[PDB]
Design a protein around this ligand. Structure first.
Ligand SMILES: *[C@@H]1O[C@H](CO)[C@@H](O)[C@H](O)[C@H]1NC(C)=O
Ligand SMILES: *[C@@H]1O[C@H](CO)[C@@H](O)[C@H](O)[C@H]1NC(C)=O
Lengths: 52, 49
């Protein structure tokens, strides 16, 4: 597109069409007031008893 | 005129099934004993409360 008589320092842009899911890190902002849960993954490597 | 919202709460760790400490209250105890007796040239053993 082109905008007539509308300088830079006055506009904004972003990309908004996504098809994959992402972890909800505390370092990234929420997309909506109430989150939309899609799935979950597990944490490996559990504990056990041994001797040393 | 922007704002930020933050929240947090506390839960119980998963590892509590293996690493934990327990508190008990104690009462009167029982007793038991075991003996050796030399009887008519042989050794015999007994066990009782
Ligand atoms: C062994 O592991 C079980 C659970 O996996 C736990 O209940 C028990 O206390 C453990 N024993 C020792 C000696 O760590
Ligand atoms: C068993 O009896 C013998 C005597 O016949 C004695 O010398 C021995 O010490 C007794 N056993 C034990 C464990 O005391």
């Amino acid at each position: 597109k082109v905008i007539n008589n509308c300088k830079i320092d006055q506009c904004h842009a972003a990309v908004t069409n996504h098809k994959n899911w992402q972890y909800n890190s505390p370092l990234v902002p929420r997309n909506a007031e109430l989150g939309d849960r899609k799935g979950k993954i597990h944490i490996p490597f559990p504990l056990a008893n041994v001797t040393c | 005129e922007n704002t930020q919202l933050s929240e947090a709460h506390v839960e119980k760790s998963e590892s509590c099934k293996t690493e934990f400490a327990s508190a008990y209250r104690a009462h009167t105890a029982s007793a038991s004993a075991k003996l050796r007796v030399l009887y008519q040239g042989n050794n015999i053993t007994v066990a009782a409360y």
